[PDB]
Each structure stands twice: as C-alpha cells, then as structure tokens.
Design a protein around this ligand. Structure first.
Ligand code: HEM
Ligand code: HEM
Ligand SMILES: *[C@@H]1O[C@H](CO)[C@@H](O[C@@H]2O[C@H](CO)[C@@H](O[C@@H]3O[C@H](CO)[C@@H](O)[C@H](O)[C@@H]3O)[C@H](O)[C@H]2NC(C)=O)[C@H](O)[C@H]1NC(C)=O
Ligand SMILES: *[C@@H]1O[C@H](CO)[C@@H](O[C@@H]2O[C@H](CO)[C@@H](O[C@@H]3O[C@H](CO)[C@@H](O)[C@H](O)[C@@H]3O)[C@H](O)[C@H]2NC(C)=O)[C@H](O)[C@H]1NC(C)=O
Lengths: 186, 186
C-alpha cells in the first residue's frame, strides 16, 4: 500500500500515513524540518487512531518484525499504555535496549468508539544496532494488529499473543516533514 | 500491493499475481495473447494456492466488493467448490446471473497442507452490468479471506460469514498475457 498526506480533523495536525481499511486504524507520521547543514533529527510525531476493538497495535519502524525499532500501544481504560520494543526471530518482542523516548501528547483521546494515541518519539529514527530510518528518502513501514487483549494491560512490558493481522505501506519520508512541527509539540 | 510475474514450480504455468504474507495465499492470473485485430478474449486462467486453514477465499475482479464479478472457492475434502457471485451492498453476495463459466482445471491439487485451485474463467473480463476489466491496461484486484468455514461446504451457493481479512493489489494486465495459454488449456 502507499501512504499519503492528510490532516487531522480535530487537531489540524498534518500527517503522512494510511488508514488500514480492514481494521480502520489510521497511522500518521510527521517529521521536523529537513536539515541541510546538520544531521537529520532523530525524532518524529505519530498518531494511531484505532477503533476500541483494536486491543493492541504495533508499528514496525523499519517495515519488518525483526531487528528494527517497534512501537506497541493499547488502551487500558482511560489511558494509553505504550512501549518501545525489539524482536529477533519472530517471538514476543521485548523492551528496546537503546535510547528512545515515547511521550504521549495531550491530543491523545480515548472515547467510547476509538482510542487516538498522539505521541512524540525521540531517538526513534536511529537505533542502537546502527540501523535506522532515512528520513530524506523512501521507506517501508509496517503495522501489526490484534483484537485479543494483552496479558497484563496495566504493564507497559506486558506479554501478548501474536498479531491477527499485519501490513505494510511505502512512505516517502522526504515529503513528510513539517515547518509546523515545533508547534505540534506545544 | 503490486503484482509480479512468477512460475508455478510444479505445473510450469506462468502467472502474474501476489502472495499475501499474512495468510500466505498466492493469487495468480494469466491471459490469452492480446489480439492484433478486434475484440480481446474475455477469458483468463487463475490460481489460488492456499494453506488448508484457509476456509474460503474470494477474488473481486474489479477490485471492490460491489458492482463487479466475484469468484468464491473453498476446499471440501478433495474437491474445490467454487461459484461466481455478485454483491449488491455489503451483504451476502449471491449467485452471478451473467455469462461467466468457472472450470476447475486438472492441475488443481489438494494435499495435506494446501489447496491449489487452478481454474479457467470464461466470460469473466466483461460482466452483465456493462462493466469489466481492460486487459490492455492497469487495474486493481482484491481478495477476501476467511478462516471460518462456509455454512454448507457441499453447496456452491452456500451462505457464509463476512471475511476476516481482505486486501488489494495493482496488476498490469498488459503484461499478464502468455503465448502458452493454449497449452495451459490442454
Ligand atoms: C508474541 C507476539 C508476536 C509473535 C509470536 C509474532 C510472530 C510473527 C510471525 C510468526 C510472523 C510471520 C508471519 C508470516 O509471514 O506468515 C510475524 C510477522 C511480522 N510481525 Fe510479528 N509477532 C509478534 C509481535 C509483533 C509486534 C508487537 C509487531 C510490531 C510492533 C510485529 C510485527 C510484525 C511484522 C510487521 C511482520 C511481517 C514482516 C516480517 O515477516 O518481518 N510482530 N510475526
Ligand atoms: C456474508 C459475506 C460478506 C459480507 C457480510 C461482507 C461485508 C463487507 C463489509 C462490511 C465490507 C467493508 C469493510 C470495511 O471497509 O471496513 C466489505 C469489504 C469488502 N468485501 Fe465483503 N463481505 C462479504 C463477502 C465478500 C466476498 C465473497 C468478497 C470477494 C469474493 C468480498 C470482497 C470485499 C472487498 C474486496 C472489500 C473491500 C473493498 C470494498 O469496500 O468494496 N466480500 N465486505
Ligand atoms: C471519538 O474519537 C473519534 C476519533 O477521533 C472521533 O471520530 C471522528 O470525529 C471527527 C469529528 O466529528 C470526524 O471528522 C470529520 O469528518 C467528517 C466526515 O467526513 C467531515 O464532514 C468533517 O468536516 C471532519 O473532517 C472524524 O472523521 C472521525 N474520525 C474517526 C476515525 O471516525 C469521534 O468524534 C469521537 N467521538 C466522541 C465520543 O466524541
Ligand atoms: C502441497 O502443495 C503445495 C503447493 O504445491 C506444496 O508447496 C509447494 O511445494 C513446492 C515443491 O514441490 C515448492 O517449490 C519449491 O520451492 C523451493 C523454494 O522455496 C525451491 O527450492 C524448490 O525447487 C521448489 O520450487 C513450493 O514453494 C511450495 N509452495 C508453497 C506455497 O508452500 C506442498 O509442499 C504440498 N504439501 C505436501 C505435503 O505435499
């Protein structure tokens, strides 16, 4: 599939991403302004808008399950529980051992039909194995879905069962930067 | 997703299509030679190679659920049960009333791990609603998957439950024609 630009209706944030039509989960990404005189920033802002029947959602930042930074999130009552994870060999991903900071932003909402997770991800484009994303070029992102809740929803590091669906989308990161990035943070 | 050319290792048939990595179902299509003078053929040969956990598979020949010819098939023991369907709305598709003939070809195989449906679809590029596929250009196909059995597997017109997954892929029909099509029919 292929990402495209869209605007968040409520917040007005401008993102690049997709809506998966099967589970109707929207995934959006926006990046700080492209640099030419400095190395690119290692952070970005993302959003996941998911029907409440989505019991956990994962994002694979390099487009594959193994050896890339994973984000995993679920709603637990009125809050989002989230974590950075990593997998080798197609088993339960565990806590990421590098430096990566997930901040839930206040645009985040949980209501009766959907959870909307808006987050800042610092240190997420470059990983502690030397891998990472090139935000000036074209890449692939992947997502994972489950409609079965995690084993222990109040634990960010909870274990859980394999996803019931997963998918990919191509993204042109060079078009995903915003001059308004700093304001999304305030 | 995007289709690509591939050869069936067993049969040697050359197809254009994809493998869905989630359910590991392969969809392949091949068309008779393009005509130099006159109308194109309205038939094609297809194959679905599915793990036996695949309880029913659908193909939407115009890429959407409604207003296009649908093919539905499932394994019933050592036989493939299949039918042409049509959907008015997002509800149980019913028997297609147009001129479309599905023939199971002798290369069809059911073993302990997979069912491989090889079929001829006559009159399947043009439908009785006036629409159809343009075999000289580029289009979109879609597939539907269920891991739950149909209500009566021996009835080709069986009712069944909504798919548990569905997906799309682009296909360049202009490169999906084969000089060996006649040989596939023999
Ligand atoms: C206990 C939980 C997990 C298990 C046992 C598991 C297992 C698997 C297996 C067996 C596959 C291969 C499926 C196929 O190709 O037929 C797979 C693929 C994949 N998984 Fe997971 N998974 C789990 C959690 C996750 C999470 C949390 C994410 C994302 C944050 C993830 C993302 C993916 C992706 C994107 C793929 C497809 C690409 C690839 O093959 O690398 N998985 N997973
Ligand atoms: C009782 C059986 C069926 C029911 C109730 C049903 C229901 C639905 C629903 C509610 C959607 C919209 C899903 C979404 O966008 O969230 C849909 C999508 C779709 N269905 Fe079905 N469906 C059934 C059978 C089939 C079959 C037999 C096929 C193909 C042979 C098919 C092909 C598709 C496709 C390709 C889509 C996505 C594109 C579109 O929205 O038209 N469906 N179906
Ligand atoms: C619960 O949260 C969900 C997710 O944020 C909310 O759904 C969304 O509501 C907004 C505003 O009503 C919808 O926005 C717009 O779409 C309509 C339809 O085309 C358009 O006419 C408007 O101009 C605007 O662009 C949005 O599409 C919808 N998003 C989702 C994924 O459904 C919902 O508002 C919240 N419900 C409650 C309990 O407050
Ligand atoms: C049931 O039928 C399926 C489908 O025909 C069988 O799977 C297929 O088996 C063939 C081997 O005859 C595989 O081709 C092989 O692929 C490898 C590369 O991975 C290549 O090195 C070989 O030369 C050959 O081309 C084919 O990939 C495989 N297809 C799938 C979807 O798995 C299956 O083995 C049969 N099961 C039984 C129990 O007989």
């Amino acid at each position: 599939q292929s990402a495209s630009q869209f605007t968040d209706p409520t917040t007005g944030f401008q993102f690049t991403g997709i809506t998966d039509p099967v589970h109707d989960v929207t995934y959006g990404f926006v990046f700080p302004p492209l640099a030419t005189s400095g190395a690119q920033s290692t952070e970005f802002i993302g959003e996941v808008v998911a029907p409440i029947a989505s019991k956990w959602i994962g994002i694979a930042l390099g487009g594959a399950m193994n050896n890339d930074l994973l984000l995993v999130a679920w709603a637990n009552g009125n809050q989002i529980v989230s974590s950075t994870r990593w997998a080798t060999g197609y088993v339960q991903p565990t806590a990421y051992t590098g430096t990566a900071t997930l901040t839930t932003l206040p645009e985040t909402t949980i209501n009766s039909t959907h959870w909307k997770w808006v987050f800042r991800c610092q240190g997420c484009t470059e990983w502690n194995n030397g891998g990472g994303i090139d935000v000036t070029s074209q890449g692939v992102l992947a997502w994972a879905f489950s409609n079965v809740a995690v084993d222990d929803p109040s634990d960010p590091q909870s274990t859980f069962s394999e996803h019931t669906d997963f998918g990919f989308f191509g993204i042109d990161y060079s078009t995903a930067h915003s001059a308004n990035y700093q304001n999304y943070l305030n």
